[PDB]
Amino acid sequence: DVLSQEEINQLIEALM
Amino acid sequence: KRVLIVDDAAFMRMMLKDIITKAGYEVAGEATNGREAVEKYKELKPDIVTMDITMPEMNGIDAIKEIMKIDPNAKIIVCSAMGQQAMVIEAIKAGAKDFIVKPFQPSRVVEALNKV
Numbered sequence: 519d520v521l522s523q524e525e526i527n528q529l530i531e532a533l534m
Numbered sequence: 535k536r537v538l539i540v541d542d543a544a545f546m547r548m549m550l551k552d553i554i555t556k557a558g559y560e561v562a563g564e565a566t567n568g569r570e571a572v573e574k575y576k577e578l579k580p581d582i583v584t585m586d587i588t589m590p591e592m593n594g595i596d597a598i599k600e601i602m603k604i605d606p607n608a609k610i611i612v613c614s615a616m617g618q619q620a621m622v623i624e625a626i627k628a629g630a631k632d633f634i635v636k637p638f639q640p641s642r643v644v645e646a647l648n649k650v
């Protein structure tokens with residue numbers, strides 16, 4: 519269940 | 535900018551150090567597990583840390599928590615195979631500023647160094 523880097527960039531922004 | 539590279543894999547530490555220096559940063563030191571990472575962070579006081587998750591002795595999450603205690607303004611980029619949503623959330627909650635999943639492309643390391 520590993521996310522993509524775009525998935526992560528997205529998730530990081532969400533988290534800020 | 536002085537970087538501490540944390541990862542238990544000799545090859546990864548080798549390739550990260552190569553990317554960081556060629557991007558104009560200074561490699562301050564390396565650590566091979568979470569306890570050493572906290573130990574080196576205290577000793578070296580780097581500007582930036584790159585952090586693996588899966589390591590013997592003490593994982594990246596706990597090392598993040600340990601470095602944040604030593605220094606609330608520590609700047610830590612995770613670089614790990616453990617790219618699940620719950621791990622990204624946990625690493626960001628613990629105080630990391632960025633997260634790069636392995637395998638990664640080298641430009642993403644560069645932008646992460648810049649960002650911090």
Ligand code: BEF
Binds near residue numbers: 587588589614
């Ligand atoms: F060992 Be890692 F968390 F890629």
Ligand SMILES: [Mg+2]
Binds near residue numbers: 541543586587589
């Ligand atoms: Mg590892």
